[model samples]
Target chain A: FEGTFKEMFRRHAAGVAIITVNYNGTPYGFTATSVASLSAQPPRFTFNMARSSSSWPAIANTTHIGVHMLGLDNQELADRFARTKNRFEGDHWELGPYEVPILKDVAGWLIGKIQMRLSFENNAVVVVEVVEGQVGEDGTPLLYHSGAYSQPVPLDYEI
Target chain B: FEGTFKEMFRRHAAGVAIITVNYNGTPYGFTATSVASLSAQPPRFTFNMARSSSSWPAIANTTHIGVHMLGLDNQELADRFARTKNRFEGDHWELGPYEVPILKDVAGWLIGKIQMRLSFENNAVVVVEVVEGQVGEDGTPLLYHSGAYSQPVPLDYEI
Candidate 1:
């Protein structure tokens, strides 16, 4: 069922986002496709992370996180955060509110307080309550599917 | 920050899915973009729903759920589940294992046990442990972005 489970999600494309957190003066981050909106009234969202991730140690201790919504031009940023070691060495980011490392020029960004963290097996489902955020005018979105990054093209069919 | 939060996600693209639950011989469903892979060891996934949704009454009581990953061809099905009341009036579905009404010919389908249900504010974050599932060979994925259903187009750029 693992193979089927993996392949099933591979076929289900999702948006790309990077979650960054600063714990005890050290910055840790990772690329995530598990971002999802949870509520509008309270302005909350959720994302999942594994306890085995390199960022997990710091992520497990952080109270606030910076969520960056990737645009079409953020493929490299997403890839860097996902697979590189020196993710925070570039000038594209700086410490923002709550001392979280914020990435610049993203389609959207949010500073959220970690409201709850639930552990099931080897994963942790983290829920965040939005404290503040900014939206950019970028018109396109980045998507992940079949192990590649892509952009969204509207379907013109009318029902 | 509500408007910013809403507009921020509008610029983000997410894979579309439909979650269905059966309670007291009645089936209820809704379109969701909150599906995300949580872990691989136990084969788990997660999604969020509001307590205010029309399907919440039944959803709050069900122990099992049928999760269907939509493809490009399932647009009509997705739209139907999202907006129509007579969602199961058609011949596109049938009762499967655990008596969960499974949608046929989807990109993939899963029968999951509702392991954890956590409530925050007006929403409920449900976690499911995948018990059984099947994957299809569909090539493209269905994405929702900026209030429109879209398809993925590879960027085809190299660094």
Candidate 2:
């Protein structure tokens, strides 16, 4: 039941985001498909990370971080962040105000301050208040569907 | 273009949740379609509230709160909270440890401590750390799609 529930959820496409943080002068990142807006007044958002992931513990202490929502063009960047190999190897990003790495040429970006952490069933949910962001040229959002990457089709077509 | 983009997002259903806060001895609640798991360790989750809602002021205070994710049976409860009138009127709920109202029949409920507020364009995003919750019976989740309410359909179908 658990696996089926998760598989069903994976079919619900979500905009891909890369959560990046600089910990003790080292930068770490991971690809996340679970980012969601939490509030509007204070600009709060949340994303989940596996406790066992190497990047999870590194940014746990950072005061602030960057959340980059990838455009459709950045599939390679998404792959780079998801793996255990060198995350920053040849990747290009400009450091923002808090020395957080901002992924170049994405749909949009937000800088946030880590406000809270909640521990639950094998994952840690991190809540960050988006303090600042840059709205870029809009395009098709990166999507995850049926356990793999997919895209949206025009509504006029008959399924 | 904006209309098309909006329509695309509407077709993509999201997790449904109700965020409630105590406002001067009265409980104010709002229905959200954008709740997501933020972390697993130190359990945290995030949800966004419309800035224009009257419930925002009460929620802005960093206090103990309740986050309820309704199962299939709780659709009526969702409708009750979504409106501007008669919130909690004839509603069936039990008082949680922190005096937060816990909807009795929800599929699951989480009691959390609000850590911070992130301000955005005319909205406030709230990040919360789940202190504790009860995972009850497993059931299909209530869903929101295309600016309307919906439920998940089986992945396979035949004409």
Candidate 3:
């Protein structure tokens, strides 16, 4: 049953991001595909993680978090963050707004305050309000769909 | 301000879906990029819609709704539903479970009963337990990112 349900939803293509949180001198991060814009005016966003996930506490307790949007070129980075070990041991980054760690050379990025957290079922739906971020040069997104990483390409048309 | 926020989040690409609710023989639908899985147990999902949107009243009054997952070839279908006029005028569909209108040739589709409704900031955060749906053949998903419709290509890597 879980397999069918999971696969049914997996067909929806989505970009990936690394949600990073820093406190003191340490940083905690994890890969996510749930990032989505929730509001327009005043700039608010939302993403959900398992309530029992190891990455929950840092983001939930911190005043702000950094979301590094992955590009098609960041396949290795995405795989690294998806793991449970050596996430930031060798990664290059700098301190961005809110003093959170921002990954170097990303497609785009967001640094924002933890505006609200709504707990549902076994997941914690985190909502953040935009303080500031960067929109890098245009390129294809690092996509995830049907249990695989995806790349975007020209379609010979526009909409 | 709105432009900045939208651009920042647009970097996160996602698939387009048509959220449809039917009353009598009429169908009301809207485009959404925020649909996401909420729980695996009992197979639940979540998505938000603005309360003031023209499509809200039908879903609010209905007990069940239909969700159509679009494919990379359905850009025109996505655009048509995203607009306000003549949405379903010539669109081909068949009556699905619970009498919900199911669009033809979607990548996938779901018919589910509303499980819960949470009100937030002029929007309705809906949770549904999927009672029935289809997991279609493998195909590229229709993507939306950076303020444009996108097409998914192959990735040389896996995650």
Give the candidate number with the greatest TM-score: 1
lDDT of 3 by residue, A1-159 (tens): 566567767788878888889866688888898887766665777787887788777876787898888888887889888888878887477777777988887787878898777776678668787888777766768888877888766456634
How does candidate 3 fare on TM-score? 0.89
Total backbone collisions, model 1: 0
Q: Compare candidates 1 and 3 on TM-score and give the better one.
A: 1
Residue B135 lDDT in candidate 1: 86
- DockQ (Cα-based) for each candidate: 0.87, 0.12, 0.58
**How much is the lDDT of residue A76 in candidate 1?**
90
Candidate 1 Cα errors over 4 Å, as ranges: none
Off by over 4 Å in 3: A23-25, B23-25, B157-159
Tens-digit per-residue lDDT, A106-140, candidate 2: 76678889987765556766778777777655675
lDDT of 2 at A112: 84
TM-score of each: 0.97, 0.58, 0.89
Which one wins by lDDT: 2 or 3? 3
